[PDB]
Design a protein around this ligand. Structure first.
Ligand SMILES: CC1=C(/C=C/C(C)=C/C=C/C(C)=C/CO)C(C)(C)CCC1
Ligand SMILES: CC1=C(/C=C/C(C)=C/C=C/C(C)=C/CO)C(C)(C)CCC1
Lengths: 161, 161
């Protein structure tokens, strides 16, 4: 479903601390409650020397903020990664300047809109209107139905509480 | 993909302690390693008074046996439940005598064989040849590619170590 990817991505560069400024899904159910499936908060991006992508995040599970560790396996396309799991899901980097923001999404193969969510990652706990612009632009086509956004205070909180 | 379900199921009855005697998937990848997605060990079945199905299990995550809690939502069909998550997955009870064994499976909608795994649940840490018969019978049609089985000793171990 996602048609924009970042040309000439340097995945090494995207390493470090990240803030999930905003999130969007094609289904309200994926983001509605705090225990919603794709409602995850990114701690840091950790690209492996063989070009894989270790992702650190938090996610509410059974009344508690629990840090999680996911691994995105590199594919032929530099901006597309596969999360080693059921139903196979892709991780697409849409766009990034490495030092300010990063836009990427997650779509479940064989069923886009019935599985798809995007985030706007920023380096600091500052809201970046510039980045939000790019994020909305990119999503302007996508069939999104829920949209979230956090404030500097929630961003310094675990699970953006 | 799964075509046999248990007529006249009394989900209340299946409550209690359960042993994952054996497991099978349509994909070796779902069960191969200990961190394999559908490689989960069931602790106990807990059916809710409104007829939902709370499931307690263990599952290896990042070099550690971690207890997990999943919830299967009742559907129009008494033996079919839906696990509240991405890609929507069904939980089907194939057959049970409530006090000896329980056969159920998990298939991911819109893609059977590219997502499907079954277990043979027993009440005691004893291997039940009778039950294994039924489990193999039921799977005899299904396009399974990996098959596991545990021993009383592994069954009294967390994560059947
Ligand atoms: C949606 C989303 C992401 C996916 C996260 C997943 C699939 C988390 C799974 C967590 C677990 C272990 C859940 C089971 O309890 C990634 C970071 C790819 C990119 C940004 C959007
Ligand atoms: C295969 C299988 C089961 C499914 C388990 C699942 C889907 C576990 C998910 C765990 C998490 C939270 C993983 C993310 O890290 C159930 C008990 C339905 C029935 C027996 C076969």
């Amino acid at each position: 479903i996602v048609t924009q990817t970042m040309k000439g991505l340097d995945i090494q560069k995207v390493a470090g601390t990240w803030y999930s400024l905003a999130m969007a899904a094609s289904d309200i159910s994926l983001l509605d409650a705090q225990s919603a499936p794709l409602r995850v908060y990114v701690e840091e991006l950790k690209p492996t020397p063989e070009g894989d992508l270790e992702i650190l995040l938090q996610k509410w599970e059974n009344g508690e903020c629990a840090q999680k560790k996911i691994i995105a396996e590199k594919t032929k396309i530099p901006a597309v990664f596969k999360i080693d799991a059921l139903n196979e899901n892709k991780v697409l980097v849409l766009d990034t300047d490495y030092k300010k923001y990063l836009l990427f999404c997650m779509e479940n193969s064989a069923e886009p809109e019935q599985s798809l969510a995007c985030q706007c990652l920023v380096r600091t706990p500052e809201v970046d209107d510039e980045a939000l612009e790019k994020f909305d632009k990119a999503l302007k086509a996508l069939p999104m139905h829920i949209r979230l956004s956090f404030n500097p205070t929630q961003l310094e909180e675990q699970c953006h509480i």
